[PDB]
């Protein structure tokens, strides 16, 4: 899963399984929507994969869905709180 198998409505990029580039970008509930995106996830290994479409967000494990479906999806809380993206 997510080596070049991503949640299909993906993109090949050159840096990572996930980048956390359209990470869903909201803190655990949507109303923290503070942290930017990618900054506090940073994959160190950054190895080229796939990654979510250039198109929508990462809710979680890297299922692009539009921050639309993300902010509904906090029913399993996309929660960072440490560093959990």
Do not use: W
Request: charged residues 40%.
């Amino acid at each position: 899963k997510a080596t070049m198998q991503c949640g299909e409505n993906e993109k090949y990029d050159s840096c990572g399984s996930k980048e956390c580039d359209k990470k869903c970008k909201y803190d655990g509930v949507e109303e923290e929507d503070d942290e930017e995106p990618n900054v506090p996830c940073l994959v160190r290994v950054c190895h080229q994969d796939c990654v979510c479409e250039e198109g929508f967000y990462r809710n979680k494990d890297d299922k692009c869905v539009s921050a639309e479906d993300c902010e509904l999806d906090n029913m399993d809380f996309i929660y960072p709180g440490t560093r959990n993206p």
